[PDB]
Symmetry: C3
Subunit: 91 residues, 3 copies
């Protein structure tokens, strides 16, 4: 094929794979954020239940990486605008 | 150098760096998954050991992002198929 | 525009978005590492405070993914060296 079509097709192929990787990274980060926060709640509930009638300074922290997860999903979508339209490679 | 060789070389350079980043992301996610699950087990063991003879509703969750980690490693490898073979830029 | 300029501009656009995604991934991983380790410390402090005068084998693990986070930030920066300089597309 024409050199420019080989280049454009290989680029578009790579972008599609990178798009998949961004969605996978965002999904994994969201699941980690959910479990970390659930387990922080469990630990804080344990401290409270040990203290309430039928260790006071111990507090589990929560995580919020939602802006980062949303950005990854945004980039995965907007990379469509960086794909090369082969019909625009004039001849 | 020829314009197409500059483009192809810069593309191939970027893909190699992105490949490294995918492997690093997958490694980091795996280590987080391991520690999160180890600490969930530790918390659940604490609740159990406080209750067994020498807080019942408290349960730490586990995380499984293995499909996402495997996909990142898969993309890092398969991006090799998106590299531009310079020998195929005919003259 | 010229086909090579379309290709080079689309490539440079994609790299910039991928750079943003790497910085976001590194930021999210750092926040998860911080909270996971803070909550490991909280759990270990709980075990200790239950045992000290006014469950011994229970120990929360810590995570260290700093090499991976640093690599992601390094790639996000060094991808600048993979951008195509349009002034070098001679005519």
């Amino acid at each position: 094929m024409e050199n420019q079509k080989l280049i454009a097709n290989q680029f578009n192929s790579a972008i599609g794979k990178i798009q998949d990787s961004l969605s996978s990274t965002a999904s994994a980060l969201g699941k980690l954020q959910d479990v970390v926060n659930q387990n922080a709640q469990a630990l804080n509930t344990l401290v409270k239940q040990l203290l309430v009638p039928r260790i006071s300074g111990i507090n589990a922290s929560v995580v919020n990486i939602q802006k980062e997860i949303d950005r990854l999903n945004e980039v995965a979508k907007n990379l469509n605008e960086s794909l090369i339209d082969l019909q625009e490679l004039h001849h």
